[PDB]
Design a protein around this ligand. Sequence first.
Ligand SMILES: *[C@@H]1O[C@H](CO)[C@@H](O[C@@H]2O[C@H](CO)[C@@H](O)[C@H](O)[C@H]2NC(C)=O)[C@H](O)[C@H]1NC(C)=O
Length: 197
Amino acid sequence: LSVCMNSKRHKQEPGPEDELYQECRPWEDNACCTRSTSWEAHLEEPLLFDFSMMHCGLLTPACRKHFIQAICFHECSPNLGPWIQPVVPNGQEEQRVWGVPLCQEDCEDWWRACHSSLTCKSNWLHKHCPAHEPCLPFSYHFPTPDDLCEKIWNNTFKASPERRNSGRCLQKWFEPTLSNPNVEVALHFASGLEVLF
Ligand SMILES: *[C@@H]1O[C@H](CO)[C@@H](O[C@@H]2O[C@H](CO)[C@@H](O)[C@H](O)[C@H]2NC(C)=O)[C@H](O)[C@H]1NC(C)=O
């Protein structure tokens, strides 16, 4: 069984979407996001989410695409069940995800595409960069892809030591023509991976 986290944006239960904006397309088969949310995920300064683009200067389109894919994954993936946690324990009205293990390629590609960009914080989870915070290189706040994946959204993701096709990590994006590779990874974690064997 696949579920969606409780929030003011996510759908109650996973369901197919007829039209999702470009980067959120691979989840059209079974999504937790509405079409309105997927369009919001592509804005340069999105306001609907708890995240916020804390970048200064110019963000390259390749770097921005990885952020959008990460937002699509967080908003549309029906396979985040085993990492759902309450925003305020103990109550399940507001829910988040914690330590979703992203494969190394997803973190590395994200880190390399954003390597030349500038940011002002290492943790973007709550909307604009204040003038007193210096605009430092991406590689300073995130010296490794591990630091980027884990710190960018306050441990929303975990930097998995595994790589793609290992059955032990998730991809924040995949080709829409391909079958969703995260369905059986999430079920693997739901079946006791890394806590019981
Ligand atoms: C994510 O982590 C950052 C840093 O750990 C938090 O930013 C801090 O926010 C509190 C007030 O909310 C203050 O200590 C400072 O404004 C921030 N400190 C630093 C070092 O930036 C942020 O609040 C966290 N967000 C969530 C949702 O947990």
